[PDB]
Amino acid sequence: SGLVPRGSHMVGLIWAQATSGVIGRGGDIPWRLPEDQAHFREITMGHTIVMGRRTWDSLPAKVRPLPGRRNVVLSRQADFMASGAEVVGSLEEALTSPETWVIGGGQVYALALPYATRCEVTEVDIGLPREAGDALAPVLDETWRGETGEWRFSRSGLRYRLYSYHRS
């Protein structure tokens, strides 16, 4: 199907996770998956994106701010320099755009989850176990519903699938 009705406010979370729920370590995403970059890009294009400061830090710098999207960086550092983005000091202000995609990281997903009505999740079939210091994906309960895509191979051979969850 791929349809998801929307209301006067849409707050979406988008992430890619290992089976174990690892999304981040050492300030990076511990795999590369071209189809997921393409998916992340097309979903978020033209929208406001919200990210924690550490996620802004983890962006390759030549791709800061992410092109074609309104970049919003959540930080408690009032003097934080984020060239080409805006810095907001609270989650409330961050989610004021009528359509917002939260693009990371572990901290901000957790805080934003209660307001979210879509989760766009790439499951990467990689057996990375949770380690000390890892950033972790939220656990979705059964208020979330939607569609699970088929397993696909990237040309590299890495296997992945897409979940598109929503709720009222």
Ligand X SMILES: NC(=O)c1ccc[n+]([C@@H]2O[C@H](COP(=O)([O-])OP(=O)(O)OC[C@H]3O[C@@H](n4cnc5c(N)ncnc54)[C@H](OP(=O)(O)O)[C@@H]3O)[C@@H](O)[C@H]2O)c1
Ligand Y SMILES: CCc1nc(N)nc(N)c1OCCCOc1ccccc1CCC(N)=O
Which residues of the chain form contacts with ligand Y (CB under 6 A)? 14-16, 29, 36-37, 39-40, 55, 59-60, 63, 66, 103-104, 122
CB of 39 to ligand Y, least distance (A): 6
CB of 60 to ligand Y, least distance (A): 5
What 3-state DSSP class applies to 47?
Answer: coil
Stretch that binds ligand X, among 41-49, 68-76, 139-147, 148-156 (CB under 6 A): 68-76
- CA torsion sign, 126 to 129 to 134 to 135? positive
What gap in Å lies between CA 118 and CA 104, rounded to an integer? 14
Q: Which residue has the tokens 């393409």?
A: 38
Residue spans of beta strands (DSSP E) within 22-144: 22-24, 48-52, 70-74, 86-88, 99-102, 118-124, 135-136
Contact code string over 120-149 relative to ligand X, x by CB under 6 A: ---------------x--------------
Whether 20 contacts 124, CB under 8 Å = no
Under rule CB under 6 A, residue 164 binds ligand X: no
Question: Annotated binding residue at 48?
Answer: no
CB of 1 to ligand Y, least distance (A): 20
CA atoms within 13 A on the CB side of 153: 3
Interface residue list for ligand X (CB under 6 A):
15-16, 23-25, 27-29, 51-55, 58, 74-77, 80, 89-91, 103-108, 111, 135
